């Protein structure tokens, strides 16, 4: 049963949530290989764990920069959640630690690259190719939401493709364990639900809205609301209007009208039937949810590899030092990390 699987999952999660792992490695145990992504909100590197020779993705945050950006609690959320979860389409923390300058989160490496890269290159995905990825997100959100977690940053940039062509939902910087309503303005303009833009209290329904955005973007090759500046995007999102490409199936358009529903009473994922209004929709009729979860469905695209620690599916970024001060920074702020 799904209910019963989730009950056991929650028991597993709560135990780790209430007693988080802490200080389970050291920077000197890893060989730094390459920057896989980078921004104001930190960076992610491929590293090699020397004791096992396993490759991992290592997120590095500069404690001082986190503080300046008011992301202290959000970062504590990220680490505390990611050490506790366990799901085929999430990369839980294998290790975390900190030093005088930085916070380190070490996770399973997905060598296939960001969905963003393949989506942009290829143009758009077929409806079946998109449905295969969407199915994985639906299951992940069912899992997360059952643990009272909201994700808050769905987009192809955060979705990594693994060796089998299945995805990992990465970057939990805005993820939060909340019962009831929350208020933080966060996420990415194109994927922001109207509630968020209009400064309302909001709930897990914003993730189901973001799903509508992702499915649209995957199938169309561009997002349903775009413009050159965020403010113009926000005007489109709250308008209540969306246009679909002529090639979108009838089933696809119907799913999306119900995901991209400005009215919370009518948004799929937020009705009394919850996620099953999505899972039982005609667009997913061919989807075997257990086969997806078990990862026995054949991926519509498997990525090119040329070995372990291959990075050819990732863009090249300027490589910056990992500096470690001789003075501890922000000790109290990140005491629990």
């Amino acid at each position: 049963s799904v209910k019963e699987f989730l009950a056991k999952a929650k028991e597993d999660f709560l135990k780790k949530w209430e007693n988080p792992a802490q200080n389970t490695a050291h920077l000197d145990q890893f060989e730094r290989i390459k920057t896989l992504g980078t921004g104001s909100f930190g960076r992610v590197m491929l590293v090699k764990h020397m004791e096992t020779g396993n490759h991992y993705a290592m997120k590095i945050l500069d404690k001082q920069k986190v503080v300046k950006l008011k992301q202290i609690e959000h970062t504590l959320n990220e680490k505390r959640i990611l050490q506790a979860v366990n799901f085929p389409f999430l990369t839980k923390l294998e290790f975390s630690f900190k030093d005088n300058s930085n916070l380190y989160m070490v996770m399973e490496y997905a060598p296939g690259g960001e969905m963003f890269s393949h989506l942009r290159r290829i143009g758009r995905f077929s409806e079946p190719h998109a449905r295969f990825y969407a199915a994985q997100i639906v299951l992940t959100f069912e899992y997360l939401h059952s643990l009272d977690l909201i994700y808050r940053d769905l987009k192809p940039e955060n979705l990594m493709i693994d060796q089998q062509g299945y995805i990992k939902v990465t970057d939990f910087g805005f993820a939060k364990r909340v019962k009831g309503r929350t208020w933080t303005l966060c996420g990415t303009p194109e994927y922001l639900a109207p509630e968020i833009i209009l400064s309302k209290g909001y709930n897990k329904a914003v993730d189901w809205w973001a799903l509508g955005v992702l499915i649209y973007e995957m199938a169309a090759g561009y997002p349903p609301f775009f413009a050159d500046q965020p403010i113009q995007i926000y005007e489109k999102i709250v308008s209540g209007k969306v246009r679909f490409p002529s090639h979108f199936s009838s089933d696809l358009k119907d799913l999306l009208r119900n995901l991209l529903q400005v009215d919370l009473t009518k948004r799929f994922g937020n009705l009394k039937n919850g996620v099953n209004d999505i899972k039982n929709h005609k667009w997913f009729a061919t989807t075997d949810w257990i086969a997806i979860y078990q990862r026995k469905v054949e991926a519509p695209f498997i990525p090119k590899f040329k070995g372990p620690g291959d990075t050819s599916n990732f863009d090249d970024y300027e490589e910056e030092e990992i500096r470690v001060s001789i003075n501890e920074k922000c000790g109290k702020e990140f005491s629990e990390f």
């Binding site: 909100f41 950006l69 942009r120 966060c186 194109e190 561009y222 413009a227």
Partner: peptide, 20 residues
């Protein structure tokens, strides 16, 4: 076309998160 309008826009690259 909508595709052409997208490709000519400033937001075809990786998109940054926002905040207060």
């Amino acid at each position: 076309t909508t595709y052409a309008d997208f490709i000519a826009s400033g937001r075809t690259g990786r998109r940054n998160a926002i905040h207060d």
